[PDB]
Ligand binder design. Structure first.
Ligand SMILES: C[C@H]1N=C(N2CCN(C(=O)[C@@H](CC3CCCCC3)NC3CCCCC3)[C@H](C(=O)NCc3cccs3)C2)O[C@H]1c1ccccc1
Length: 241
């Protein structure tokens, strides 16, 4: 498939190489964030990851990772040429929590080299959250292997209820998970994906959300809040030329 091809977090299971070929790991200093390769030179992440404005030259993007800590011969390490946070991102409400990383092209104009293990994810036009974050709130360490968990969408009516997130859910956000708790994104999953298999398009992986924020991890009535990628389609297309 041109995009969304697939080869093979609290309450998740290990996601081996090729399960999320689009997932990107972003490193700088002692900080980390996840992202999604949406085109060979473009990675979509959360704006809150880059609030402190690290210099692009200090960033490293790694594609093809299974364990974050291992050196991996087929994995692709790329420099970041520049990045763009959404101009409306608010560090107080977390509205408009999205950012684009423009990967550094080589002498031949190439960034990510596509393979069975590295493939872009489709943009919108069943659902899982993935990441290397804490496997429970307060965990001393990030997960060693990439984790994946199946989480369903929650309507704006149910997520904006007073016992759930109330008035905190603003336009551009969506919720996914369970009101029962137990399965969700957690600290360290920032910027990562919420991908769905598009039944209408041969089950191709489609990026529906960006892991943004949560009140706890897997708590009852507190599902994870994601940036609604479909809400920003024109912004993404406008800034990825
Ligand atoms: C270091 C990393 N910590 C964070 N953040 C600390 C706050 N946060 C939350 O959701 C806040 C709420 C927000 C609401 C809006 C206003 C600000 C508080 N609550 C969490 C609950 C779980 C424990 C941590 C706090 C963000 C987050 O974890 N997002 C991922 C998640 C998705 C679902 C559940 S946690 C960002 O991001 C990373 C990072 C930052 C900077 C550079 C690189 C990485």
């Amino acid at each position: 498939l041109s995009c969304g091809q697939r080869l093979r977090v609290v309450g998740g299971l290990v996601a081996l190489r090729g399960a999320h070929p689009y997932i990107a790991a972003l490193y700088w200093g002692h900080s980390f964030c996840a992202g999604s390769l949406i085109a060979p030179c473009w990675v979509l992440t959360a704006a809150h990851c880059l609030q402190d404005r690290p210099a692009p030259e200090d960033l490293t993007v790694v594609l093809g990772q299974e364990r974050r800590n291992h050196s991996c011969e087929p994995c692709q390490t790329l420099a970041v040429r520049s990045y763009r946070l959404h101009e409306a991102f608010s560090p107080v409400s977390y509205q408009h929590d999205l950012a684009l990383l423009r990967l550094q092209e080589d002498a031949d104009g190439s960034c990510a080299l596509l393979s069975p293990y590295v493939q872009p994810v489709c943009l919108p036009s069943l659902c899982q959250v993935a990441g290397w974050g804490h496997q429970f709130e307060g965990a001393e360490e990030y997960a060693s292997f990439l984790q994946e968990a199946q989480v369903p969408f929650l309507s704006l009516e149910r997520c904006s209820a007073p016992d759930v997130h109330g008035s905190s859910i603003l336009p551009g956000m969506l919720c996914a998970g369970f009101l029962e708790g137990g399965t969700d994104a957690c600290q360290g999953d920032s910027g990562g994906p919420l991908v769905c298999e598009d039944q209408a398009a041969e089950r191709r992986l489609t990026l529906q959300g960006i892991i943004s924020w949560g009140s706890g991890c897997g708590d009852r009535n507190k599902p994870g809040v994601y940036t609604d990628v479909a809400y920003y389609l024109a912004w993404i297309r406008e800034h990825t030329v």
